[PDB]
Symmetry: D2
Subunit: 150 residues, 4 copies
């Protein structure tokens, strides 16, 4: 196939429908919505020094919207963490992403957003960069994973 990157995760459940943004050169902006779990999730990547908009992974729920704006390129993620559990408001009870938190190399923290409820996942990055996301979304964020590169 084409060029490719190291992929970790997914954390979360087998619900909703798969999506993969693919890889890019870094991250500029993450946009998510949240209440008791994570709803929407959408990313403005850097591609070779300019913004590139990933597909929107919108949840239909009326959740609070946040926009995490990184000082790209000198600021970048060193950690992604959160929790996974079901959220009872569904017909199926499969685990979903209840919370996300992000930390950066400058010591900014974004989140937690959502409810720190369930099982903990934590991706600390000692060397390397986050360069794309993938997940599964239905009414909300069922699962999340990350692509990495040097």
């Amino acid at each position: 196939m084409a060029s490719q990157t190291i992929t970790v995760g997914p954390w979360g459940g087998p619900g909703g429908n798969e999506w993969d943004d693919g890889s890019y050169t870094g991250i500029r902006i993450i946009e998510l919505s949240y209440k008791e779990a994570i709803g929407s999730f959408s990313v403005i990547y850097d591609l070779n020094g300019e913004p590139f908009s990933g597909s929107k992974h919108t949840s239909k729920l009326p959740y609070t919207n946040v926009k995490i704006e990184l000082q790209f390129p000198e600021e970048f993620l060193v950690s992604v963490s959160g929790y996974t559990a079901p959220f009872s408001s569904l017909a199926t009870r499969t685990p979903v992403v209840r919370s996300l938190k992000f930390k950066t190399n400058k010591g900014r923290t974004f989140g937690p957003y959502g409810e720190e409820d369930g099982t903990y996942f934590n991706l600390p990055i000692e060397n390397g960069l986050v360069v794309g996301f993938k997940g599964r979304t239905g009414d909300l964020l069922d699962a999340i994973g990350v692509h990495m590169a040097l």
Copy 2:
């Protein structure tokens, strides 16, 4: 300025002495000891098709020794997981690696070894290989981290 890989981790605490095995072409044998926590941890890497013995990180503790023999190259790790916590019996209450578990692409599970107490960590690898480990060792395994390559 020597060649680098993606490194994730570490998971555990600031105790003991740093070690870094660096990177190789894959994993052949993992060797560890356990009881209440992980003591010893050593690895036989693959280096360009032949075994390469990593440095030993051995604990003096009279622990149970286990040898994890992967059917290299067809079988490789797809998950590293475990638990970190203080171990009350150290002259310090700093967190160490209480448990480890390993899963492979053939569906085998090795562990849990040690005791599942404290904060869970989990690295599921969807695409990528483990090519090295780094860590910290005092009397026990204080921290572990993993290098990944395509």
Copy 3:
């Protein structure tokens, strides 16, 4: 700072103005113009399975246009080669790219385009993929280099 790739070259001289398309998932189309030397050079990359248009590095000179359409992703480049040297009136001081030739994994050759004069350059790729180009262009393609991944 941002994601990086293996970069080889440049081949050619220090004239014209520098450009770098950066890196992508692979190559779909190369468009160039030629006569005595290479003029125009532009690329349609694959970005995560969709085409992405590289910046245009156009020559005004009335040269022959060629479009090289690979059957991506099954078909890819396995060799970039060419010749560099000064050219007559337009590039008297410094070498420019006089010719380019490309080989693919399916045994297609595209070119030589231009004239085979001066100093030979040859990049046979045994493993890895071309994921981007860089260069310098004035009236002509003064230089070219390649980013590679995998």
Copy 4:
């Protein structure tokens, strides 16, 4: 399969017997022998901060031996270049490695060794590191290629 690197080449002919040292962390020492072509060729690699000897690819011919010692890790190769052509004093008139030259980031040039006859090859490295060699040896060095990593 297991971990891989980008590999460019080969330069030279199809004669002799193939060898492939694989990949490591970097380069400490190149040893070669030369007269009107390249004879012997062997490398002491860096592996995670200690030397690792590659297999000797020695020529029995009465040539001049040369040890290229880099100031590892701060000094590394940025260029491998040379010439290939058949060599009169041989039975098969396939091309062999006639000359090699090596440049470093420190500004040091080692070579040219042998004789600059036949077809030029030239790998300038703008980003990335040489982390192994592969080749072919009979009574002389028939071909050479390079593995590269970030």
